[PDB]
Every structure is written in C-alpha cells, then in structure tokens.
C-alpha cells in the first residue's frame, strides 16, 4: 500500500471583503477534498461522493454543530493574535492537523498554526510541547502547555484517532485512492537545444523524474517542472536538461512511479 495522509485545514480572516467568508475548513484524504464547511453555508458537506455515500446524515449534522463552535473559537483566537501583534487591517490565521500511514506500517502526526501565512506554533507530540516563533506565539504556548491534559489529548488523537479515520476513509474511497494509472512518457527537443521529458495521464501524483548523463545524475543542470492536475483525475509533469553543442553525451530520462521504473534513452 502506498503512503496515505489525512489533513484538516482551517482558515480565518479578520476583515473579509464582501462575500468572502471569515472562516473555511476543508478535509483531504491524500490530494482529494473530502469535507468542507464555511461561515456562509454554515453546513459541513462532503466534497467526495464516496464520502457522501458512506456516512449518514447524522454525521454531517453532528460535525456541522462542531464546526459552528470551531468557527467561533477561531474568531476569538484570531482576535487575540491580532491585538497582541498590534495589527490594523485584515490578517489571516490557519490550522493544519493530520497524520500519515506510511507504506511500511509506521505513522506520523502533526499539528501547527500559521499567522499571515508563516509558521506560528508547531506541536511536538513526543516531547509534548509547542514551538513558538515569536513572543506572541510564546504567550499562547505558556497557556496551552499548562493544560497537560489537553496536550495528552492531542497526542492520543494524532496517533490513534486520526490513523483510525484514515483507515476508514481509505476503504470507503479505495476505488479512487488505491488505483494506479501509469504515465505516458515521451521526449522531445525545444529551442541552445533542450531535452524535455514529459509525462501525463498518471495517478497518484507522486512521481520522480530525473535526467541522467552517461549514467551520472546530471543535477543542478536539471530543471524540474511541477506536478500538475490535468482536470480529469490524473496529472502531468516534465523535466528539462540543456544539451551541449561541443560533445555528444548519452542522455536518458528516468521516471519512477508506484513501484515501477522507466528509462527512455535519447539516441
């Protein structure tokens, strides 16, 4: 089984523009949205059909009420941050929590907060402590770290509850999450002359492409495209290296994807 992760994201905005919501929260299983809530709908709803089809209205009803409580908790917490920063205008506050089931069976877990898109507090569930980036964060840490019970709760949740949910969702969504769609990899030349290694049509989006020269990993000489959504459930990417006019070389594209390795030599 490949690596899988579950994540929940919260975003709050102190002075949102007309329409723009002040609170949003989205869940992901790997790269798929599975849940959404926001301060305008005020309803939690699946963004995945295999979610909607496997959880009864009682679940959405229950989590709708919780998110209405969390929205308010966020409103309050962001009010507090902005006043201890002495900041005017609109500012943002964010949370992320979740876990990974790695391929070998071991697990990871993580929880952190952001202010204005930079790290604010990061949890370490092994020392049972918070890391603070500035003195506004330091004051939240002394407060949060005094409820030894509440940190014990986070460690239990990240390690047992998160992993349990993720196992449950992997089964609901397995036809999506556990399929393999191998990539279609070609090569071509572009004006200096460049070798572009293009792949497309593949799922999951975890793929490694690299150019090798004469059996050595040309690196710092490689130029990596990003992995991009195609719009239909699959992804494309590329990597380019720059050809030498003065000496021939044996260039070859290497692609790894879901336990399969691919090599295209350039004649």
């Amino acid at each position, epitope marked *: 089984m490949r690596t899988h992760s579950l994540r929940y994201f919260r975003l709050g905005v102190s002075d949102p523009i007309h329409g723009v919501p002040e609170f949003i929260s989205v869940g992901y299983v790997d790269s798929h949205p599975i849940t959404t809530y926001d301060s305008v709908t005020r309803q939690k709803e699946p963004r995945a059909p295999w979610m909607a089809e496997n959880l009864a209205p009682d679940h959405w009803e*229950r989590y709708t009420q919780l998110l209405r*409580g969390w929205q308010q908790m966020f409103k309050v917490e962001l009010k507090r941050l902005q006043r201890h920063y002495n900041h005017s205008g609109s500012h943002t506050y964010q949370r992320m929590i979740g876990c990974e089931l790695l391929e070998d069976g071991s697990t990871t877990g993580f929880l952190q907060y952001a202010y204005d898109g930079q790290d604010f507090l990061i949890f370490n569930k092994d020392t049972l402590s918070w890391l603070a980036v500035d003195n506004v964060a330091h004051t939240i840490k002394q407060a949060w770290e005094a409820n030894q*019970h*509440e940190l014990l709760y*986070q*460690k239990n949740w990240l390690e*047992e509850e998160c992993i349990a949910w993720l196992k449950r969702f992997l089964e609901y969504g397995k036809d999506t999450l556990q399929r393999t769609e191998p990539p279609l990899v070609r090569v071509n030349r572009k004006e200096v002359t460049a070798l572009f290694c293009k792949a497309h049509g593949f799922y999951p989006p975890e793929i490694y492409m690299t150019w090798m020269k004469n059996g050595e990993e040309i690196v710092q000489e490689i130029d990596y495209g990003d992995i991009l959504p195609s719009g239909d459930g699959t992804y494309q990417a590329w990597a380019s290296i720059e050809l030498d006019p003065q000496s021939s070389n044996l260039y070859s594209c290497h692609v790894e994807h879901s336990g399969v390795h691919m090599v295209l030599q350039v004649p």
Partner: antibody
Amino acid sequence: GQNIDQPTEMTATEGAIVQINCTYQTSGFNGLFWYQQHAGEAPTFLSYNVLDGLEEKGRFSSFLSRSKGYSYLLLKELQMKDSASYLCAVKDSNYQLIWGAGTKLIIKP
Amino acid sequence: NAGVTQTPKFQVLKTGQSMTLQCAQDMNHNSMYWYRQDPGMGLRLIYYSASEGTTDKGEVPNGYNVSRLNKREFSLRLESAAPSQTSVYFCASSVWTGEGSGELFFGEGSRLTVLE
C-alpha cells in the same frame, strides 16, 4: 453499539482502599472522565485520562488502559465524606459523551 | 462566580401541562447542555448548544425543545408534560465543545414529577 458498564454499588470500610472499575466498548476514544455525585447534589469533575497509565490527585488516583478498554478510580484512606455515586464517562470518535450508570459508594464507619 | 444557576429546584405538573426550565452560567462558557438523570441509567442528553447561535438534539429530544437565548442562558421547554418525563434535570456547560479534555460544570438539578 456503544456501552459503558460500571458496578451498581460497592461497600468498603472507613480508612480502607477501594477501587471502582469502568469498562467501555466505544466507537473511538477521546478520553475517559470520572465525576463525583453526592446524593441530592450535582456531579463534579474528578479526573481525566486519555493516555495509558495512572495519575495521582491527592487521595484519589485514576488508571487507564486503552488497549483493554478499562479504567479504575482508586480511593485511598476512605472517609465518610467519600460516600457518593461515582460516574464514569467516555468521549467517543465524535466527541460526544457516553455515561455509565454510576457506582454508589457506601462507607461503613 | 455563581457557576451554573438553574431553576426551579422542584416542580409538580399535571399531564398535558407546560413548563420551562431556566438555566444560566456566569462563566463565559460557549457550550451548554440539558441532561436527564433516571434511576439505573447513565445520564442522557436532551438538547445541546455548541456555541451561541446553534442548538441540536441529543439522545432523547422527543417531548422537549430548547432556546439558546444568549451566551448565558439555555432554557428547556416541555410543552405537554407526560408521566415518563418525571425525572431530575441537570443543566451543564463547558468552555468549548469539541475540545478533548474540557470538563462539564453542572447546575444543582431540577426535579419534576408528572402526575395524571
């Protein structure tokens, strides 16, 4: 089917040790609470366990084994003022409390 | 520091009659609950209020309804009292709901007997 099961009633003697069990079969687990309820009065919070092990709070200790679905509340050096019901409660996967029926503790002077 | 103040402490009702149970908390809590205690059973949630602005049912809502009037108060309403509603009722509150370790703070209880 979630259930919490605690013994109906217990009798110990003044100055002795008593140990109140609570076993749970839940849908997930976010913590197990102990509350104290004097007759005619309101329940008050005693303790909380979410990891494994034992925590000491004065004359009362409370234990938790997540693997076994099991917690006890241990009352040392019993006193008549310890006569009450003891209520155990478990937060499930959806953060909603499930309440045991309660254990009446009777103290022989 | 009053804690959780609920009233009345005692009440006798006839079948079919109406009654509202008052509950207030001065602790600036966000979540409030209405529980029903009966012999030989664990507590049972009737309605709850996760924050000011929202309520939802619990395990045993039929025959009851509620109003989160403001941040302080949370009222439970019987509207056609029935014998099976004879019970002791406890209002409760916590700082938040959906936190993990937060304890509940209880009122003194309200005891209702419903008679034909």
